[PDB]
């Protein structure tokens, strides 16, 4: 009720042993009343690491997207050693959204590592049951086995009607996903853990389809980008193996579904100025016949007997021997180019004179023609170059023209394909212009480059006039905080870009930009500026392969950065970057990598690896950081995964107030925006959620002063949220959330929620279950409020009540007594947290009334087992409002799975194999349904204290020869766990 505090564990320990005498009654009662629940004491079980590898085949659906709406691939297993380390070998094959699938090694939700199928963005198949949202859905297949060696799993995805179907050895898998959101590009993905060798049959060159694809399903090898060569890589990696060592890698940029939609700049909407004819004729005359200039007597000599139809591709007629209605299309063509120039804001220059004054009619002696004599019809107009502004300008001309053509082709029904199939309306060139290969780009734009340099020769030289996941901060553990001496640590810039590097205090904020506040002293080498509570130019921009020295000396209270063994002087010329630096808590190596950035954080584990150290740092008196440190230095990376954390009392903008004991008003937690209508007002979408869940029953059975018998027979619970006066109901969203809700959307609405309907299959094809899973079961307050209500000055103070019922798993929402049509029916053993996602529009925003209704027990009786039959509303200190914080720290694992990926053969296809088993001990928080690393407690000292006192309670309750209690404790703490904790050095 009050919460996790170690003093109650101290009391429980004092209950057991008294002056060296064991009280058997207390030792048995504490065990029986605490251990079996497994909901209050942190649990530790050893699990396996899970690593996912994708073929980077990103396909999707959008309004006008060039991508095809059906795809199919295969994965077949070569070897599986099941149960290699006394745990299920995590093997899963399926699709996954490119925006939302973040299978970071270690940690994760549930009781284990996450693969494809442990999140509502990825949908996998274990061979026996489907996986989505971290739950197993048993399906009917002829094999009824987990995918074993010499077994092929076919997987197809249809976007037009969203459906992912699986097939085991040519036998259809009954039960498919449906109605999943298409926001983002799906890609094939397998999670293999350890002791698994699989291979991707993508069809065509990349493997062979052992089973024929279903009709209408294109092979996945026909979706590789033209500019990109097919490969296999992890979904997202914060560390990549390299020659010098572990290369820390920042967040990567993935293509969005909006990129594949070719919306061009409209050119026919604008009218032409009265100068239309003048530029049009001069531009048209040459462009009529440049191709003739390039093809007469070099291609196929034209004959007047025919018309460019029997090996006569060029033609030289300035009189336009082809029909004039056909020919004046070229005049209207140059007019259209003028319209496009107007759309891009290009005017009529006349900077130079007429180019015909310096016209050099270039008719080579080799080039000649019978008809119309031999004359150079194209206007060479001597020579003229292209200004770089005009090269980028003609680049966007070609971009706009190709986007117009691509949009028109999409309207016709064309789609992108690696291998061109004209009858199937498939070709490799309708991908958007930035997605076009460079050869296609230049082949598009060469003619317009000639035309635009002709325009410049005429004289028309007219110019055309946070997500918290674009920086990744890697810092040392707070355990290695140095407070004295001189330390040196190198940082190599493998990829040039925004890669801040320096020394940070241990209280470094996760989402705050590195060096923006006073908690860091960093150097931005991309543009050359030192950052600490601001920015100032310093040093010089670096290049690829450059190493920064990053020395601190706290004897002199200064920080020095050196580039390639040369001290970076400041703008004033002083050698030291920062001066007069208090020691404070301490300093830690730190580096924030930007998007698509690679940096080698070379701490001084060995001076042999430390290059340029003797050049700068061995002489000056700087000890290398971690010189004698036997084990590798442990790092912490900004996880960039939204996590629900308690609202800080000292939050500059948000306040939570507890009011209780009122005769009419029940206990309640209200939210107040402290500084509203001020210079610093945050209208960001605040995601608030109560700390404790209301778990649903294991089996969903059919089951004025209030009636006591009904009160004891009640399985429904009431909970209201009152929206304060002046707060818009159009900005509130009242309901429930699952413990795996990770969505910090700044413009969140009801259509952004994760929702996948697993429709079970029967042999005849008719549906069996059709069970829906959703991430948050919420209802918009704008739906309750009547349209047309404006200002909110009526002070309605609408309350939204959530009548949940655990015996049937059914929740229904009400507003001011008016029943709402929004009803939800969920699975058994589901944990729902009360939650409101509100955009603040008033000084007082919302308030959680934890009250009750007629013949309905309050939510305290739902969360708290000790108050199971208590109908009086109450709120102990554990029940607190928590905000969705965007970024939190995460320990980098000491070792990662070594996965060998390579193309086995031209017909075998790409293959992925892992043979090294890695195990970690997981600290599972029961009520939140998330497991951290047991080593991650080295910096979270409150959980460390609680777990240490929990272990001490275990020892006290099994002490003095309690063999029965020791046997009871062996279930919670296994022999493998004990041996792994003994051997673990971190």
């Amino acid at each position: 009720k009050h919460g996790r505090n170690h003093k109650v564990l101290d009391v429980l320990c004092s209950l057991c042993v008294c002056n060296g005498v064991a009280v058997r009654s207390n030792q048995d009662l504490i065990t029986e009343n605490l251990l079996p629940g497994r909901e209050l004491l942190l649990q530790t079980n050893l699990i396996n690491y899970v690593t996912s590898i994708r073929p980077n085949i990103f396909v999707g659906r959008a309004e006008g997207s060039t991508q095809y709406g059906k795809w199919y691939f295969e994965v077949m297993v070569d070897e599986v050693v099941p149960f290699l380390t006394a745990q299920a070998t995590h093997l899963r094959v399926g699709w996954a959204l490119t925006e939302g699938y973040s299978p970071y090694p270690g940690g994760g939700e549930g009781w284990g590592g996450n693969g494809v199928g442990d999140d509502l963005y990825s949908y996998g198949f274990d061979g026996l049951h489907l996986w989505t949202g971290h739950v197993a859905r048993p399906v009917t297949s002829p094999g009824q086995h987990l995918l074993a060696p010499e077994d092929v799993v076919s997987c197809c995805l249809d976007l037009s009607v969203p459906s992912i179907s699986f097939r085991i050895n040519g036998c259809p898998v009954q039960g498919v996903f449906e109605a999943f959101n298409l926001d983002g590009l799906f890609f094939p993905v397998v999670s293999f853990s350890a002791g698994v060798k699989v291979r991707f049959l993508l069809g065509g060159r990349h493997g062979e389809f052992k089973f024929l694809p279903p009709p209408g399903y294109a092979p996945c090898h026909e979706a590789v980008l033209p500019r990109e060569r097919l490969r296999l890589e992890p979904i997202k990696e914060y560390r990549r193996e390299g020659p010098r060592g572990p290369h820390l890698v920042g967040p990567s940029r993935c293509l969005s579904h909006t990129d594949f939609v070719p919306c061009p700049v409209d050119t026919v909407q604008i009218v032409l100025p009265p100068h239309l004819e003048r530029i049009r004729e001069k531009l048209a005359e040459n462009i009529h016949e440049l191709w003739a200039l390039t093809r007469i007597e070099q291609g196929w000599t034209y004959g007047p007997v025919r018309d460019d139809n029997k090996r006569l591709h060029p033609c030289l007629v300035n009189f336009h021997s082809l029909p004039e209605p056909e020919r004046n299309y070229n005049l209207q063509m140059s007019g259209e180019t003028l319209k496009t120039l107007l759309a891009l804001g290009c005017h009529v220059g006349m900077a130079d004179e007429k180019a015909e004054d310096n016209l050099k009619k270039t008719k080579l002696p080799k080039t000649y023609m019978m008809s119309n004599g031999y004359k150079p019809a194209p206007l060479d107009l001597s020579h003229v170059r292209l200004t770089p502004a005009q090269t980028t300008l003609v680049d966007r001309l070609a971009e706009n023209g190709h986007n117009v053509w691509a949009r028109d082709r999409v309207a016709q029904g064309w789609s992108y394909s690696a291998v061109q199939d004209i009858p199937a309306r498939r070709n490799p060139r309708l991908v958007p212009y930035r997605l076009l290969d460079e050869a296609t780009k230049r082949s598009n734009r060469d003619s317009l480059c000639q035309a635009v340099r002709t325009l410049l020769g005429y004289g028309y030289n007219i110019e055309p006039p946070s997500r918290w996941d674009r920086v990744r901060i890697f810092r040392a553990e707070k355990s290695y905080t140095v407070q004295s001496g001189r330390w040196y640590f190198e940082f190599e810039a493998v990829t040039t870009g925004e890669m801040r590097v320096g020394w940070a205090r241990p209280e470094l904020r996760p989402d705050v930009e590195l060096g923006a506040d006073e908690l860091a002293y960093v150097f931005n080498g991309h543009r050359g500026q030192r950052w600490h509570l601001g920015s100032e130019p310093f040093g010089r921009p670096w290049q690829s392969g450059d190493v920064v020295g990053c020395m601190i000396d706290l004897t002199e209270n200064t920080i020095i950065f050196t580039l390639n063994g040369e001290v970076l002087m400041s703008d004033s010329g002083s050698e030291t970057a920062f001066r007069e630096i208090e020691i404070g808590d301490g300093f830690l190596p730190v580096c924030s990598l930007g998007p698509g950035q690679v940096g080698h954080l070379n701490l001084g584990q060995d001076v042999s690896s430390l290059r340029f150290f003797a050049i700068c740092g061995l002489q000056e008196g700087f000890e290398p950081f971690a010189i004698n440190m036997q084990r590798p230095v442990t790092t912490w990376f900004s996880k960039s995964l939204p996590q629900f954390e308690p609202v800080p009392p000292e939050h500059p903008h948000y306040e939570v107030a507890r009011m209780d004991g009122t005769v009419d008003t029940p206990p309640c937690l209200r939210l107040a925006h402290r500084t509203w209508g001020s210079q610093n007002s945050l209208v960001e979408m605040l995601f608030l959620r109560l700390s404790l869940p209301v778990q649903f029953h294991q089996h969903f059975r059919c089951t004025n002063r209030d009636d006591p018998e009904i009160i004891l027979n009640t399985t429904t619970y009431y909970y209201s949220v009152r929206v304060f006066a002046g707060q818009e109901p159009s900005c509130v969203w009242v309901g429930w959330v699952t413990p795996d809700y990770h969505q910090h959307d700044m413009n969140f609405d009801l259509s952004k929620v994760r929702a996948v309907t697993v429709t079970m299959g029967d042999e005849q094809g008719n549906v069996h279950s059709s069970l829906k899973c959703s991430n948050c079961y919420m209802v918009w307050g704008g739906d309750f409020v009547s349209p047309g209500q404006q200002g909110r000055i009526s002070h309605t103070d609408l309350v939204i009540g959530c009548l949940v019922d655990l015996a049937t798993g059914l929740m229904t929402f009400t507003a001011n007594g008016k029943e709402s049509n929004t009803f939800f029916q969920v699975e058994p053993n589901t944990k729902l947290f009360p939650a409101v996602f509100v955009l603040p529009t008033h000084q007082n925003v919302i308030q959680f009334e934890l009250g009750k209704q007629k013949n309905i027990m309050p939510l305290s009786a739902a969360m708290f087992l000790s108050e199971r039959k208590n109908p009086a509303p109450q709120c102990p200190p554990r029940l607190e409002v928590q905000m969705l914080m965007p970024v939190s720290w995460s320990r980098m694992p000491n070792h990662f799975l070594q996965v060998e990926t390579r193309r086995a053969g031209e017909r075998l296809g790409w293959a992925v194999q892992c043979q090294d088993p890695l195990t970690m001990m997981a600290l599972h928080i029961p009520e939140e349904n998330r497991c951290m690393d047991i080593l991650e407690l080295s910096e979270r000292l409150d959980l460390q204290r609680f777990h240490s006192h929990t272990l001490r309670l275990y020892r006290a309750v099994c002490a003095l020869g309690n063999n029965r209690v020791a046997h009871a404790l062996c279930s919670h703490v296994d022999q493998a766990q004990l041996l792994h904790a003994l051997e673990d050095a971190h």
Epitope: W291, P323, E326, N330, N427, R429, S443
Partner: nanobody, 126 residues
Framework: QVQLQESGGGLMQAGGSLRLSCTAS????????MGWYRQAPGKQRELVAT???????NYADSVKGRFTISRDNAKNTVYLQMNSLKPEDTAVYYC?????????????????????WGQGTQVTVS
């Protein structure tokens, strides 16, 4: 938007009259130098002569037999007479309308491929 409704396709023996009609329904843009890419079954689309706006007959690879091709200016329907049917003439005739003039292209690949290619009909011919 410019969809070409090619109609006909009745099975006639060699030497039977087959006047077929491709109704080029759509915008006036991308309508000239339009040709019947008759895709032979399993064997690719040979181009029938290419007539531009104004009936400019330009002989192409498949001009084997009779091939009287004439586009109505107002009705915007190409009438292609196939009296001299041949075993080589059996194909799904697929008329495509483009804006590039025949053998006369100041653009490059974007407009070279900028053709409203509509669905034809299977002219099965003995």
């Amino acid at each position: 938007q410019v969809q070409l409704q090619e109609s006909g396709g009745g099975l006639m023996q060699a030497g039977g009259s087959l006047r077929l009609s491709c109704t080029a329904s759509g915008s006036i843009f991308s309508i000239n130098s339009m040709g019947w890419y008759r895709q032979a079954p399993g064997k690719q689309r040979e181009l029938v002569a290419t007539i531009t706006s104004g009936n400019s007959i330009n002989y192409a690879d498949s001009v084997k037999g009779r091939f009287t091709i004439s586009r109505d200016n107002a009705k915007n329907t190409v009438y292609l007479q196939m009296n001299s049917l041949k075993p080589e003439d059996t194909a799904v005739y697929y008329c495509n309308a483009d804006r590039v003039p025949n053998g006369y292209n100041p653009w490059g690949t974007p407009n070279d491929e900028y053709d409203y290619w509509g669905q034809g009909t299977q002219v099965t011919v003995s």
